[PDB]
């Protein structure tokens, strides 16, 4: 049953999905098509060891560092994409500029792991825009403290992926994440909360329409925000270890600024 209020929520859902498609070149639908073999043309090259890795660059420093810095570079790009998406969220750019920065500072990593789940199955992760696939085992076999960095992301991904969200659901969910009025140091919480409220209403309707047979999906999805926050905490601690153990390893300033005084 459609009414004018439901109609505005659908309109918002459509706008967010449209903006999501425009902002994120590699969607879940593409990632799944690559992962599941809808394919002769979308076949990833698979990196599972040093040789395959060495063969990969065809399609300077220690291996773990190269992978970690490759992972950091994609994060920077993901931040850029998520920032572009944030601006499309109605009301977002009208917020106090300090709050805009705060929302992004705290939101982007949670979004990164949400969307990274789209690129994952239990066996590994799509890399280089889906051209490559790096196995979970190969990542886990990396010298300490690098063998540990991706494992919590995979753990989250397999459980998050069981919700079977599609991109149209995800567009609203990551907008909800960004407009969190509970971020530290926010100047004006009310206008953020009002937008989140609307986004939440939109997400709820979207899940009810897109997944009618999936009971309490909305609640189950919101509960995942806990898993995301914990992933972020561990990551930052692991980064502190890296800083001290790999003094010769540069961290991208954008990421360094984001990490500066997190929770």
Between CA 206 and CA 6 the distance in angstroms is 10
Q: Applying CB under 6 A, which of residues 23, 27, 75, 206 lies at the interface with ligand YFB? A: 75
Could you give the string, one character per residue 145-184, with x where binding to ligand YFB holds by CB under 6 A and - elsewhere? Answer: -----x----------------------------------
Nearer to ligand YFB, 78 or 178 (CB): 78
Smallest gap, in angstroms, from Cβ of residue 69 to ligand YFB? 8
252 assigned ligand-binding residue: no
Q: Which of 87, 66, 76, 133 is nearest to 109 (CA)?
A: 76
Smallest gap, in angstroms, from Cβ of residue 60 to ligand YFB? 11
Residue 239 touches ligand YFB, criterion: CB under 6 A: no
DSSP 8-state class, residue 126 = E
Q: Alpha helix (H) ranges present in the chain?
A: 4-23, 28-36, 50-56, 63-88, 97-118, 136-140, 151-161, 167-178, 189-210, 217-245, 253-259
Residue 53, classed as helix, strand or coil, is helix
60 assigned ligand-binding residue: no
Q: Applying CB under 6 A, which of residues 112, 157, 199, 203 lies at the interface with ligand YFB? A: 112
Instruction: Describe the crossing of helices 4-23 and 189-210 by its angle, rounded to 10 degrees.
Output: 90
Structure tokens at 74: 């994609």
Residue 127 touches ligand YFB, criterion: CB under 6 A: yes
Strand-pair category, 132-135 with 45-47:
parallel
Residue 67 touches ligand YFB, criterion: CB under 6 A: yes
Considering only the stretches 32-40, 120-128, 169-177, 199-207, report the one whose residues sit in contact with ligand YFB under the rule CB under 6 A.
Answer: 120-128
Q: Which residues bind ligand YFB (CB under 6 A)?
A: 56-57, 66-67, 70-71, 74-75, 78, 112, 115-116, 125, 127-128, 134, 139, 150
């Amino acid at each position: 049953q459609l009414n004018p209020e439901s109609a505005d929520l659908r309109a918002l859902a459509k706008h967010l999905y449209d903006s999501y498609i425009k902002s994120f070149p590699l969607t879940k639908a593409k990632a799944r098509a690559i992962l599941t073999g809808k394919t002769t043309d979308k076949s990833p090259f698979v990196i599972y060891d040093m040789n395959s890795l060495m063969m990969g660059e065809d399609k300077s420093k220690e291996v773990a560092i190269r992978i970690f810095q490759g992972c950091q570079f994609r994060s920077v790009e993901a931040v850029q994409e998520i920032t572009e998406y944030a601006k499309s969220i109605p009301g977002f750019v009208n917020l106090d500029l300090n709050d805009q920065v705060t929302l992004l500072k705290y939101g982007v990593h949670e979004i990164i792991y949400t969307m990274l789940a789209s690129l994952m199955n239990k066996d590994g992760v799509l890399i280089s825009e889906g051209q490559g696939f790096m196995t979970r085992e190969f990542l886990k076999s990396l010298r300490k403290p690098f063998g540990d960095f991706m494992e919590p992301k995979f753990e989250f991904a397999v459980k998050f992926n069981a919700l079977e969200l599609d991109d149209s659901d995800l567009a609203i969910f990551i907008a909800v994440i960004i407009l969190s009025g509970d971020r530290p140091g926010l100047l004006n919480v009310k206008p953020i909360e009002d937008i989140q409220d609307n986004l939440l209403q939109a997400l709820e309707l979207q899940l009810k329409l897109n997944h009618p047979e999936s009971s309490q999906l909305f609640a189950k999805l919101l509960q995942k925000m806990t898993d995301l926050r914990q992933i972020v905490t561990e990551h930052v601690q692991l980064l502190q270890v890296i800083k001290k153990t790999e003094t010769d390893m540069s961290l991208h300033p954008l990421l360094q600024e984001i990490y500066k005084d997190l929770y």
